């Protein structure tokens, strides 16, 4: 209730033609606009019942950034972005207890451009049921963060990995986790 | 994929000091991670950060009503969005769930918001000085924080180890004993 | 309450 920072962060990426729009409060995402569905997606469902946001204005901004990106690309003699590989960290949100529910978090940090393939590997095999992820989150250094979540039940016989693919990495990066 | 990438970024930043009393607005435009134009509410006009933004700063500041609009953004944009989400962002309080389990004494403080938190170890009454390692504030990305703060100290007899957690969600310190 | 997007500005051309 004293010192805060609210950031409206937008980006547009050629030639992938992927843009994003989100509101950041003190490092947390208030909401983002799903460009496809043209809907406002609150990071917490409860937020959508206390505030609103007309997502159409986010799409108009992304259109303007797409158009400015082409302009800025020409001003720079088509200077491309230099890939920055990510530092990724796997952790849990709660102390681990056998047969007690928990969630695995894969924190992909300090990377650009905002394109990553993230796959959770249970016993070296990809797992998808129950997975979730955040949009790309802005950083003060103008790189990007991203959170991937995997709810699970800890067991002695289950080993987990977080497979991250980024164009800055010469090879895909696995971050391990066991008990 | 081989072809090069081009990234445009826009960040409209609202910096609040003592709530909506001192607000600074920053309209920041980026090519890759390079800021090229910026409106600073302390300056009152767009300024080029690099050469790449020189035509935008000159063009934008000349637009009809532009300077009036941007100079008003601390009220019409920042202070406004502050109050819109105040009840569930600035005022958001989620009390921490604390667990104290063994290692050559691990106080796990999970699920709290905001991230301003103080945890202090107490060995039978006095706060322990050395041996206190802290994992640091880590953000779960879901409006919850967590942190682990450990103590490297030998258990004696039936010495009571207490982890005292002070958090803006609680009126009084939360103490867990081992 | 409604959040207000700050509109993106069209670059000089």
């Amino acid at each position: 209730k004293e010192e805060h920072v609210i950031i409206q962060a937008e980006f547009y990426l050629n030639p992938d033609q992927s843009g994003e729009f989100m509101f950041d409060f003190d490092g947390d995402e208030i909401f983002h606009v799903d460009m496809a569905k043209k809907e406002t997606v609150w990071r917490l469902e409860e937020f959508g019942r206390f505030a609103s946001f007309e997502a159409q204005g986010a799409l108009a901004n992304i259109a303007v950034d797409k158009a400015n990106l082409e302009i800025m690309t020409k001003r720079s003699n088509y200077t491309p972005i230099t890939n920055v590989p990510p530092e990724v960290t796997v952790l849990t949100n709660s102390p681990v207890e056998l047969r007690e529910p928990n969630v695995l978090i894969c924190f992909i940090d300090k990377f650009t451009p905002p394109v990553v393939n993230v796959t959770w590997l249970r016993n070296g095999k990809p797992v998808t049921t129950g997975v979730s992820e955040t949009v790309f989150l802005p950083r003060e250094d103008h790189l990007f963060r991203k959170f991937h979540y995997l709810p699970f039940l800890p067991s002695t016989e289950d080993v987990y990995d977080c497979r991250v693919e980024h164009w800055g990495l010469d090879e895909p990066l696995l971050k391990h986790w066991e008990f | 994929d081989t072809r090069p990438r081009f990234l445009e970024q826009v960040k409209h930043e609202c910096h609040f000091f003592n709530g909506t009393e001192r607000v600074r607005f920053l309209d920041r435009y980026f090519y890759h991670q390079e800021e090229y134009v910026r409106f600073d509410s302390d300056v009152g006009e767009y300024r080029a950060v690099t050469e790449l933004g020189r035509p935008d700063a000159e063009y934008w500041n000349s637009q009809k009503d532009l300077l009036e609009q941007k100079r008003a953004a601390v009220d019409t944009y920042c202070r406004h969005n502050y109050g819109v989400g105040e009840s569930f962002t600035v005022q958001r309080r989620v009390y921490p769930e604390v667990t104290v389990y063994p290692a050559k004494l691990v106080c796990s403080v999970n699920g709290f918001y905001p991230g301003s938190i103080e945890v202090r170890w107490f060995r039978n009454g006095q706060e322990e000085k050395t041996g206190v390692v802290s994992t640091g504030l880590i953000q779960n990305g879901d409006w919850t924080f967590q942190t682990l703060v450990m103590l490297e100290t030998v258990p004696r007899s039936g010495e009571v180890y207490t982890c005292q957690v002070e958090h803006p969600s609680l009126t009084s310190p939360l103490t867990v004993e081992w | 309450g409604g959040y207000r997007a700050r509109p993106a500005k069209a670059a000089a051309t």
Partner: T-cell receptor
Amino acid sequence: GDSVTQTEGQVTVSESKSLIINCTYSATSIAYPNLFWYVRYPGEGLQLLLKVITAGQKGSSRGFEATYNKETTSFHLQKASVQESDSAVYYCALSDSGSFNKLTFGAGTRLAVCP
Amino acid sequence: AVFQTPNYHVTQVGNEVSFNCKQTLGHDTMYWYKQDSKKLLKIMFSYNNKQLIVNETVPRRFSPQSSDKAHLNLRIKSVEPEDSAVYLCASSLDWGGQNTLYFGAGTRLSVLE
């Protein structure tokens, strides 16, 4: 669903008389409206007289005054002493401050100031 | 300023008409507004940087176009008598609801049977 109701038709006032042009709005689906008075002087195009973009404030121009009163949902237009040059059509307008600019206009009030 | 053209046009039902507008304010956003016979003002279109952002349920008979954010044109493919109106062009700094609209002098269209 969003409407603006203002003094209907023509208002004939002697110069130096005080003037009120009523304007109320119904915007059930708008969190924070913005309120505008636009004026069209004879043989000219529409232009802004004054606006208020903060629910408590009042705006003033050309000796006209209007107070954004969200409590009574009104934006009445007042002038203590109208001059012959105020003869014009006056439009009360509402916008949604959180979405794309779309003016919901009142029907407009023609002021004829008689010397 | 906001320049639009033509100032007056009369044409028969079924014909096509094109109105043109220019604004020199440096604004990103431009608008078509219809002022009908009884002088009621209603938004038709809003364009932001060449992209159509609002279409107030305008009949498909109407085709706006903008290849430059300073320019906004309106073509009515096959006018009907209800199209007789004054069509007002406007611009605003951007699409924010707080912005002042700057209006043009208007195009007086008369569609006759």
